[PDB]
From a paper:
Strikingly, both apo and RNA-bound Lb2Cas12a are present in the asymmetric unit of the crystal. The 20 nucleotides of the [name] in the complex are well defined in the electron density map. The overall 3D structure of the Lb2Cas12a+[name] binary complex adopts a triangular, compact conformation. The REC and NUC lobes lie adjacent to each other in 3D space, creating a positively charged cavity in the center. Residues from the region Met493–Leu523 of the WED domain participate in major conformational changes to facilitate the structural rearrangements associated with this rotation.
[name] is a programmable nuclease for adaptive immunity against invading nucleic acids in CRISPR–Cas systems. We demonstrate that apo Lb2Cas12a assumes a unique, elongated conformation, whereas the Lb2Cas12a+[name] binary complex exhibits a compact conformation that subsequently rearranges to a semi-open conformation in the Lb2Cas12a+[name]+DNA ternary complex.
Author numbering: 1 to 36, 42 to 83, 88 to 130, 134 to 246, 253 to 267, 277 to 321, 373 to 380, 389 to 418, ...
Write the structure that this text describes.
């Protein structure tokens, strides 16, 4: 009963360690990227690239696309928008079959391309040769290059480049040429004329190759030169737009800085050029007519134009941060090593990117010819900015993860990558993104197959001061009936398994299965606690009322192979009893729970000589309920701990341990403490796999917390655990309260004579065959040796003695009465009639007599008797108890201590009763003194006896 209030007392943090199993081609991606050592990998990629360019141009050289006429109508005529999108998809198809109809296409991606298709069209040959038998390295490369030959409306495909990008440009030039055929701009250099041939729809078929695009752009530049010349008439003529290239477009730290410095220099000059003013004042003079903005809407309703050009500010920040590139070329060992440089370069390219992103905000078929030509000239300067180099996951010994909208992107040897958690088929997986794919899960495509993952959405609202008088006057989950302790929730999103695969194949995602002995299709037995804590994160019963919070951070550690195993392990910090208010005065909270209850029992745990630990449970009046041992096994300290925890539940009990105050056996004891206090911080009993009723007492979501957070700052109490002096716990007859308090030494005869003159009598009991030594301890010491100091001590029984052996071990069994005879007989003392022989003993003059009398008395007083080999460790008293018997542990029936170690544990438990008397007898809240004096124990031992 008393402990059932001690749930949800304080929050606790754990880090959970689990192994990781690589899934799919993740381990290959990792191993492959451990290239180093330079190697021709990039050289062979370049060779594969140029045959891609060749095959592409050759498949499209003398090509002619049928639907081209259909589409060109829709666009040039007088919804047309959807018919164009449709006929564009038809065209994207028509490009792809022409690409797939080329010879050698079915050897794209297949290893079979290594042979003739590369050894024939050398430095290059040795580079190719070097990747025979190593073809899998281009797996990721192939998955990326696959998108060239796709009819899907994606920006990376050959069909999209030609049909969705270039073809509308080509047609828009056809629309512009009306003004150039008019006004007689017969272009300079177009000798003998017939430039009109460029703006017949059919001429586009000749621009499906890079070499036809070059030719088209070159001549159209000549026209634009004459167009720009036509500005002199003082209305204005739209310039022609250039077509983008066929899709053909980081060796060291020395080379890259010149590229950065160079492009930045070209760019800011281009951004200070007339290109920008021409775009702005064309965009202003368009009055917004036929200008469309991001899936789109037209500016014809307005105000906004001049709110838009004032992103001039993107030019100002490019300029500033280009100047800030003085940290690169003025102030600069490798570049990636530099705190500022890496940041200044990223700040620079980012600022460019936002300019491009801002530009791309514009763009339908009827769009304004002049505005969009100026926009295109300016944008051609920026579309070079796909710089997209790196400075790398599993290069390092660890990767740090974040599960949240919070990743820093720099400490440059410890930057956060995204972690995602994915559930499928009752298993748990960990995905960790390559930084270039961090946004793959921001808006994932809607799931369509049956084979899906459930991705964990990590919803956290930190520090609510995020966002109308001052401080004295809804897409989030916030639940209906400051929010800090409700501002966390996990929710789920179905994601199609093929999308996850695509990222792995592309080397953009590193997916692992989270594994422990309990996460297997072959798993058996109860759950390990850390498996349980982990499961409870995702268990809906916790999401409904949070006990377990996932701290957003996590770390992965990688030991690479060296035909040993590639080992990955995961550490996940978590908080348990998240959002509870920490109980201030926990020890009193327990002391007041005990104060209320009569029925409390005690568990005493002691260090033993033959048992490392001995546990003894006793009731409130002193009776032994259970006395159980180490070596009694029917990771060892974990078992005792798990046992002792059950006993606290089973017996409604507190725990009493030795106070290691003034003082190897005592090292495991301190380990046991630590483990025992650790355990009782947060105790969970129900370790079942099915986990049916975890909200009950001691279930996962209602753990008990019976002890205070371990810190070394500890006094004599830690919750239900109390510490008591070890004084005379093992060397005391529990049935009498008797202990050997004689401070003895055979110093000399004078001081031996009136040591033995302190006894009331020394006599023989012929009937019981023992010698009796009667005395009062007061006659021997000034100490307060309990409330009974009168005793009669008898040469009762056998004793085990270590003894002086010329051969240096031995031990023997002695019967003190018969030796006490042999000595008295040797020295002619008349004992047999039962007189008091005291006056006759102290009359002996020889010291040898007293040496041997001391030894016999000492041996009589030797209550604990042991064997070097554990064969025996028992306690025998030399005093008769309430049962007219001499206490002997070997004759125990379980109602008394079985051995000396048990006696220690028993008498430690008894002192707990004394503290229970202290706790109950004090007031609510007052400090409780637990310093038990040696005199109090002897008093308690001699009165609460048996």
């Amino acid at each position: 009963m008393y402990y059932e209030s001690l749930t949800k007392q304080y929050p606790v943090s754990k880090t959970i360690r689990n192994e990781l199993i690589p899934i799919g081609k993740t381990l290959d991606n990792i191993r492959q990227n451990n290239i180093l050592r330079k190697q021709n990998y990039e050289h062979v990629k370049g060779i594969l690239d140029e045959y891609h360019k060749q095959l592409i141009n050759e498949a499209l050289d003398n090509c002619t696309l049928p639907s081209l006429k259909i589409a060109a109508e829709i666009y040039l005529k007088n919804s047309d928008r959807e018919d164009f999108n449709k006929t564009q998809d038809l065209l994207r198809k028509e490009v792809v079959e022409k690409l797939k109809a080329h010879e050698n296409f079915t050897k794209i991606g297949k290893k079979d391309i290594l042979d003739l298709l590369e050894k024939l069209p050398e430095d290059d040959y040795n580079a190719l040769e070097s990747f025979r038998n190593f073809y899998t390295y281009f797996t990721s490369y192939n998955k990326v290059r696959e998108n060239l030959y796709s009819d899907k409306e994606k920006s990376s495909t050959v069909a999209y480049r030609l049909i969705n990008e270039n073809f509308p440009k080509f047609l828009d030039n056809v629309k512009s040429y009306r003004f150039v055929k008019t006004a007689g701009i017969l272009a300079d250099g177009l000798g003998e004329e017939e430039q009109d041939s460029l703006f017949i729809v059919e001429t586009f078929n000749k621009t499906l190759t890079q070499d036809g695009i070059d030719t088209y752009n070159s001549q159209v530049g000549k026209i634009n030169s004459s167009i720009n010349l036509y500005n002199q008439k003082n209305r204005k003529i739209p310039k022609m737009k250039m077509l983008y290239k066929q899709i053909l477009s980081f060796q060291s730290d020395e080379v890259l800085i010149d590229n950065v410095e160079s492009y930045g220099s070209v760019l800011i000059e281009s951004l200070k050029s007339s290109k920008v003013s021409a775009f702005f004042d064309a965009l202003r003079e368009s009055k917004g007519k036929n200008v469309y903005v991001k899936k789109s809407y037209s500016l014809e309703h307005l105000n906004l134009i001049e709110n838009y050009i004032h992103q001039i500010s993107d030019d100002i920040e490019n300029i500033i941060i280009n100047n800030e590139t003085f940290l690169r070329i003025v102030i600069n060992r490798k570049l990636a090593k530099n705190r500022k440089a890496v940041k200044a370069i990223k700040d620079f390219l980012d600022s460019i990117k936002v300019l491009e992103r801002e530009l791309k905000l514009i763009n339908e078929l009827e769009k304004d010819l002049i505005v969009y030509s100026a926009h295109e000239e300016l944008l051609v300067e920026l579309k070079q900015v796909d710089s997209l180099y790196n400075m790398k996951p599993f290069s390092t010994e660890k990767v740090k993860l974040n599960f949240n909208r919070s990743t820093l992107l720099n400490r440059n040897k410890e930057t956060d990558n995204l972690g995602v958690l994915l559930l499928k088929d009752g298993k748990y997986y960990l995905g960790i993104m390559n930084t270039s794919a961090n946004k793959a899960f921001v808006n994932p495509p809607v799931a369509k197959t049956e084979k899906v993952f459930k991705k964990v959405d990590y919803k956290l609202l930190p520090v609510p001061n995020q966002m109308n008088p001052s401080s004295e006057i809804w897409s989030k989950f916030g639940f209906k009936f400051e929010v800090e302790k409700q501002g966390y929730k996990l929710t789920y999103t179905d994601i199609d398994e093929t999308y996850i695969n695509d990222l792995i194949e592309r080397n953009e995602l590193y997916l692992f299965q989270i594994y422990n002995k309990d996460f297997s299709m072959y798993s058996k037995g109860k759950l390990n606690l850390h498996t349980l804590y982990f499961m409870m994160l995702f268990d809906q019963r916790n999401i409904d009322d949070v006990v377990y919070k996932l701290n957003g951070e996590a770390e992965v550690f990688y030991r690479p192979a060296s035909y040993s195993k590639d080992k990955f392990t995961l550490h996940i910090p978590i908080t348990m009893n998240f959002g509870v208010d920490e109980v201030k005065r926990f020890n009193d909270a327990v002391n007041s729970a005990i104060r209320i209850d009569e029925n409390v029992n005690v568990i005493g745990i002691d260090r033993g000589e033959r048992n490392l630990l001995y546990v003894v449970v006793i009731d409130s009046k002193g009776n032994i309920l259970e006395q159980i041992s180490l070596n009694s096994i029917i990771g060892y300290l974990s078992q005792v701990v798990n046992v002792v925890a059950k006993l606290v539940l089973k017996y409604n009990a507190i725990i009493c341990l030795e106070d290691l105050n003034f003082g190897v056996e005592k090292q495991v004891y301190q380990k046991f403490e630590k483990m025992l206090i650790d355990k009782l911080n947060y105790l969970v009993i129900d370790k079942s796999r099915e986990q049916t009723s975890p909200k009950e007492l001691g279930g996962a979501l209602n753990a008990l917390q019976l002890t205070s957070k371990f810190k070394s700052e500890l006094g004599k109490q830690s919750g239900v655990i109390y510490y008591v002096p070890a004084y005379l716990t093992s060397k005391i007859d529990p049935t009498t309260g008797f202990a050997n308090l004689f401070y003895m030494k055979c110093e000399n005869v004078e001081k031996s004579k009136r040591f033995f003159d302190g006894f009331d009598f020394i006599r023989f009991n012929a009937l019981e065959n023992v010698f009796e030594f009667g005395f009062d301890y007061r006659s021997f010491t000034q100490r307060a040796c309990g409330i009974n100091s009168k005793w009669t001590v008898c040469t009762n029984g056998e004793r085990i003695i270590k003894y002086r052996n010329p051969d240096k071990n031995d031990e023997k069994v002695v019967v003190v009465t018969d030796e006490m005879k042999n000595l008295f007989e040797q020295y002619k003392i008349p004992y047999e009639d039962g007189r008091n022989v005291k006056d006759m003993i102290i009359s002996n003059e020889e010291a040898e007599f007293y040496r041997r009398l001391y030894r016999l008395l000492q041996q009589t007083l030797q209550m604990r008797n042991s064997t070097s080999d554990g064969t025996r460790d028992y306690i025998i008293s030399p005093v008769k108890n309430k049962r007219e018997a001499y206490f002997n542990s070997e004759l125990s029936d379980g109602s008394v201590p079985k051995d000396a170690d048990a006696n220690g544990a028993y008498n430690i438990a008894r002192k707990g009763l004394w503290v229970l008397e202290q706790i109950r007898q004090k007031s609510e809240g007052e400090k409780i003194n637990l310093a038990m004096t040696n005199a109090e124990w002897l008093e308690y031992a001699q009165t609460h006896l048996l």
